[PDB]
Amino acid sequence: SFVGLRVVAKWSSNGYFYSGKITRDVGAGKYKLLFDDGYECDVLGKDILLCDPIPLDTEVTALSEDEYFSAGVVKGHRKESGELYYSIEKEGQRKWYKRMAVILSLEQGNRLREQYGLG
């Protein structure tokens, strides 16, 4: 089963995919999803991408203070003290982001759906 896997998942109409983990199979094509901020709700399998981690060379959106739409490209992964960090490139400069800060727009997530979509 998919329970216990880390994923990115879309929960609302806004359409962005956020880091979380499948915590329960709740039937009817649906999974209980615990987002990294501690919010838990049911989501559709079609709105879950089985990325852990998001692959190198993926275009993503990298959250930081006052930045809600900052696109960049994954160029590295680092595990440190039980936590995943992404190295994200934007305009020839790389910065580190914790897992929970890396999200995907609907368009960005659609690029991964064929290969990683739970369905």
Enumerate residues 27-46 that contact its own copies by CB under 8 A: 34, 36-41
Q: Which of 81, 78, 119 has its CA nearest to residue 96? A: 78
99: partner contacted, choices ligand 3OO, its own copies, none (Cβ within 5-8 A by kind): its own copies
92: partner contacted, choices ligand 3OO, its own copies, none (Cβ within 5-8 A by kind): none
Tell me if 109 sits within 8 A of 37, measured CB to CB: no
Q: Which of 107, 98, 14, 28 has its CA nearest to residue 64? A: 98
State in angstroms the smallest separation of the CB of 13 from ligand 3OO.
7
Question: Residue with the closest Cβ to ligand 3OO?
Answer: 37
Give the bridge partners for 119, in sequence order.
none
Q: Which residues of 101-115 are buried (b: 16+ CB within 10 A; e: fewer)?
A: bbbbbeebbeebeee
Enumerate residues 60-79 that contact its own copies by CB under 8 A: 61, 63-66, 68-69
Of the candidates 54, 60, 103, 118, which one interacts with its own copies according to CB under 8 A?
103
Q: Which residues bind ligand 3OO (CB under 6 A)?
A: 11, 18-19, 35-37, 39, 63, 100-101
- In whole angstroms, what is the distance from residue 96 CA to residue 88 CA? 6
1 binds its own copies (CB under 8 A): no
